[PDB]
Amino acid sequence: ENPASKPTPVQDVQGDGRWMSLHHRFVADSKDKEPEVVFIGDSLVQLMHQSEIWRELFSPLHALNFGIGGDSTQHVLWRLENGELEHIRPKIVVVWVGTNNHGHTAEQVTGGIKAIVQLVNERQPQARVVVLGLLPRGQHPNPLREKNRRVNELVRAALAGHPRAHFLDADPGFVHSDGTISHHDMYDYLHLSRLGYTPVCRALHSLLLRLL
Numbered sequence: 001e002n003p004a005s006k007p008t009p010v011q012d013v014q015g016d017g018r019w020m021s022l023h024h025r026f027v028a029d030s031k032d033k034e035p036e037v038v039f040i041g042d043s044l045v046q047l048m049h050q051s052e053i054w055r056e057l058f059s060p061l062h063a064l065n066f067g068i069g070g071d072s073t074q075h076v077l078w079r080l081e082n083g084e085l086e087h088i089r090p091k092i093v094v095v096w097v098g099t100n101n102h103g104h105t106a107e108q109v110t111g112g113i114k115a116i117v118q119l120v121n122e123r124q125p126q127a128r129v130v131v132l133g134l135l136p137r138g139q140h141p142n143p144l145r146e147k148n149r150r151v152n153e154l155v156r157a158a159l160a161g162h163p164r165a166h167f168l169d170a171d172p173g174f175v176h177s178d179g180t181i182s183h184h185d186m187y188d189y190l191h192l193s194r195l196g197y198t199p200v201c202r203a204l205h206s207l208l209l210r211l212l
């Protein structure tokens with residue numbers, strides 16, 4: 001099987017049970033709330049909630065943020081199948097995951113993303129699905145930049161004839177002419193600074209407004 005599309009939780013090898021705690025909180029969120037928009041994915045999704053941009057752009061939309069740092073596609077898939085889509089009927093689900101899929105080919109990662117969209121199409125058939133492209137990373141040109149680009153190309157091709165699945169490239173051009181990414185946009189060449197989130201969230205918020 002494609003390991004990217006075989007649903008599995010993150011095994012606790014540290015001992016504090018943080019991953020399961022987050023999942024359980026999100027499950028409780030879905031049990032208690034009636035969101036119109038559900039965001040799910042990795043640290044890029046999660047930290048969007050920690051910015052002041054969230055309360056100004058996305059809170060008004062009645063949204064839940066189920067991002068978990070370190071998640072790969074198969075982890076998001078497991079979470080969606082194991083409680084996080086229960087007791088809700090969102091209009092839109094936003095998916096952003098795949099940059100952490102180390103050891104998976106771009107094709108496998110694409111397969112994991114397609115599996116996520118399919119599951120959402122089954123459990124929440126009324127919802128439109130928005131998939132964000134994987135952002136570049138690393139200070140200089142490197143294999144992960146090519147990988148994420150290739151995933152974006154493949155995912156975009158997969159979603160193009162899917163008329164309630166929407167591929168969104170939120171990258172305003174973080175990779176400059178000299179091939180570098182500024183630490184002002186990504187403080188560690190992966191996570192987005194407040195300045196980095198600005199054009200990304202603006203792009204997303206715009207799309208969400210059109211669909212909604």
Ligand SMILES: *[P@](C)(=O)O[C@@H](C)C(C)(C)C
Nearest residue numbers: 042043044069070071099
């Ligand atoms: P995001 C891209 O999930 O950040 C990850 C790699 C951690 C630093 C492990 C949370």
